[PDB]
Design a protein around this ligand. Structure first.
Ligand SMILES: [Ca+2]
Ligand SMILES: [Ca+2]
Ligand SMILES: [Ca+2]
Length: 348
């Protein structure tokens, strides 16, 4: 059962959020991050994102310290809709900094959203159209997307990140780091390249601005070098918790929180890893905690620990990640794990 504990450490060693830095050369920001698409019959497809945003207007913008965005997405179907479509529910929150603009005032209530995409992937063209609402106070998006060209030639999940980060909920201690809203109403250019592992890549250019009362995302997408047999063109990707597991998670939370005060410190996280033959520094342990530390108080409470495990249970890991999760039990590293190599890890 305490396999839960090993992947917790794997997750805390991973980088799963949307990382933002100021553009140190000009107004704007850069971002990079990783998406895991679950392959239908098991496996994972990874997509590496590299992102640049630049104001359209001349006025000043907020250039943030490094921090990140954290995401929850639910994709569904509308049972009374016959066109190729996607209903999306999304929560996005900023974090990563422990312990303001004009355009920010445009986001205090529910804002209507229009989304317009023209795409071309390996010569298969398509258009997508989206409408819905954004609630920045809760980092909440609700949208319906329609493929207006008939059938979509790529899986819907691969488009999500392309199809309005000015709707992120920035916590009160981080308001001065919201580049996205400060760029409004005139808005910003958002550019990405997206690299599907062992496959093609998408390139995207988007204009994000207010047109009247409406926040508009207008996008061009060109995709090349895809395999007609790969997970994208071949439509191999999945479309989208028991309180039994919540019991299994609080029990795995106790293994770290040895003094049971409801929170995990760098002190306690260090103990567990050292009993698994690792030796992380104080700076590493703070960085590990900071990746899943929603409130920025430097400790992982149980809400914060749940979110990370719900997300980790949602996503299949790659082989390079299961490899390392495997070589924690196999001490001699021979391919076959002995029931003695288990007990060592177990006791610890
Ligand atoms: Ca504790
Ligand atoms: Ca916390
Ligand atoms: Ca062995």
């Amino acid at each position: 059962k305490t396999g839960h504990a090993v992947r917790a450490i794997g997750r805390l060693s991973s980088l799963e959020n949307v990382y933002i830095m100021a553009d140190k050369q000009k107004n704007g920001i850069k971002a990079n991050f990783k998406i895991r698409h679950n392959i239908e019959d098991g496996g994972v497809q990874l997509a590496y994102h590299y992102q640049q945003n630049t104001p359209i207007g001349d006025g000043p913008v907020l250039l943030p310290d490094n921090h990140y965005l954290s995401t929850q997405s639910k994709l569904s179907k509308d049972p009374n809709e016959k066109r190729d479509h996607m209903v999306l529910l999304e929560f996005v929150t900023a974090a990563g900094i422990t312990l303001v603009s004009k355009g920010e005032e445009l986001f205090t209530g529910v804002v209507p959203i229009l989304v317009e995409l023209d795409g071309d992937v390996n010569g298969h063209k398509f258009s997508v159209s989206g409408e819905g609402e954004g609630d920045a106070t809760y980092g909440k998006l609700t949208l319906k997307f329609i493929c207006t060209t008939g059938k979509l030639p790529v899986p819907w999940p691969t488009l999500v990140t392309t199809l309005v980060q000015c709707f992120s909920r920035y916590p009160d201690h981080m308001k001065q780091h919201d580049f996205f809203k400060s760029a409004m109403p005139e808005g910003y250019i958002q550019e990405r390249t997206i690299f599907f592992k062992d496959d093609g890549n998408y390139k995207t250019r988007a204009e994000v601005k207010f047109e009247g009362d409406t926040l508009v995302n207008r996008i061009e997408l060109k995709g090349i070098d895809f395999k007609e047999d790969g997970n994208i063109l071949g439509h191999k990707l999945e479309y989208n918790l028991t309180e039994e597991q919540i019991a299994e998670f609080k029990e795995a939370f106790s293994l770290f929180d040895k003094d049971g005060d409801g929170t995990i410190t760098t002190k306690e996280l260090g103990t567990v890893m050292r009993s698994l033959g690792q030796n992380p520094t104080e700076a590493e342990l703070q960085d590990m905690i900071n990746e899943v530390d929603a409130d920025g108080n430097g400790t992982i409470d149980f809400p914060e620990f749940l979110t990370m495990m719900a997300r980790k249970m949602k996503d299949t890991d790659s082989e390079e990640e299961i490899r390392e999760a495997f070589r924690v039990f196999d001490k001699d590293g021979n391919g076959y794990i002995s029931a003695a190599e288990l007990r060592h890890v177990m006791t610890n």
